[PDB]
Amino acid sequence: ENPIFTDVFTAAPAALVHKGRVYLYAGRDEAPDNTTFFVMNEWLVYSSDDMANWEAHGPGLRAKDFTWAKGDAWASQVIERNGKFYWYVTVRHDDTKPGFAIGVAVGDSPIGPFKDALGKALITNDMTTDTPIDWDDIDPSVFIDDDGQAYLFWGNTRPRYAKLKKNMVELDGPIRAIEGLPEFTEAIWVHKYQDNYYLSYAMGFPEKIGYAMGKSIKGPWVYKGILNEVAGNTPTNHQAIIEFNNKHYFIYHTGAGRPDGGQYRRSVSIDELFYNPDGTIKRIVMTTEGVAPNKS
Ligand SMILES: OC[C@@H]1O[C@@H](OC[C@@H]2O[C@@H](OC[C@@H]3O[C@@H](O)[C@H](O)[C@H]3O)[C@H](O)[C@H]2O)[C@H](O)[C@H]1O
Ligand SMILES: [Ca+2]
């Protein structure tokens, strides 16, 4: 049943599949109410072999594990490459580079331990100055294309991407502005299914999830419509999409948890995702019941 975790508040889920298990990473909401602001210090890790029963692994990483960060364990994403696990995170940078930043940690296993892979930020606020806000450099998504080129996607208000080196911890080209995403807010997730690329994102505010399709990782991106309605009792809508055991899953968050779930006290949920024959995605139907076990 959704929400899937009832002893903690979890937000901004990311997932990956590794050796027949799905690993789920989420920020932990620790705000005492829904009237002040997000309080997030650490990210939690969970895993499942059936998408229904989840093992808790505990905190895999903390914002303070980056010596150059102030705190704020915001949206993050993990990807496997060459037997390692790279965890791209959003954190508030210390005063040396004011504003939010993207950092990267690395581990030898999906449950870590993880450590700062650079000793400094990968993206700092001052690298991107086409907007005056100091929270535009948040919410990273990393994708490795069929030719072996990795890309870092990110942004709030301004969607952007850049090539990553094969070492996964350095940029390898210019930062590009992404076009084709109407009402872009945040939460980019990129995935590929058959011969189409999909870029889904939080759209407008209060946030829906919209998406665009492209014939290449570079687009051009063609908006296809609404993937998720505004989520129950939350103005932020943050998604991850994965394939597991021949089904597709839409992992997201709501404010439907207890006690007093809400905008700063969120809860991860999961529902199934379905494709149309033309490659478009049916709009999600968010449900109390959630998904049935799907064991291999
Ligand atoms: O006002 C509408 C949209 O809100 C912002 O995006 C959503 C929020 O962005 C992040 O942080 C919220 C802001 O960042 C903090 O530094 C700033 O003080 C908060 O206002 C969260 O992910 C969302 O709540 C866009 O700026 C705007 O279009
Ligand atoms: Ca910036």
From TrEMBL:
E.C. numbers: 3.2.1.-
Residues where Ca(2+) binds: 125, 128, 136-137
UniProt similarity note: Belongs to the glycosyl hydrolase 43 family.
Protein name (Swiss-Prot/TrEMBL): Beta-xylosidase/alpha-L-arabinfuranosidase, putative, gly43N
Pfam families with a match to the protein in the record: Glyco_hydro_43
Entry keyword annotation includes Oxidoreductase: no
Marked site: Important for catalytic activity, responsible for pKa modulation of the active site Glu and correct orientation of both the proton donor and substrate: 139
Coiled coil ranges: none
An individual GO BP term: xylan catabolic process
GO MF: hydrolase activity, hydrolyzing O-glycosyl compounds; metal ion binding
Gene that this sequence comes from: gly43N
Organism encoding this protein: Cellvibrio japonicus (strain Ueda107) (Pseudomonas fluorescens subsp. cellulosa)
EC top class, as a word: hydrolase
Keyword Signal: yes
UniProt xrefs under SUPFAM superfamilies: Arabinanase/levansucrase/invertase (SSF75005)
InterPro entries documented for this protein: Glyco_hydro_43, Glyco_hydro_beta-prop_sf, Glycosyl_Hydrlase_43_Enz
Top-level taxonomic group: Bacteria
Keywords of this entry: Calcium, Carbohydrate metabolism, Glycosidase, Hydrolase, Metal-binding, Polysaccharide degradation, Signal, Xylan degradation
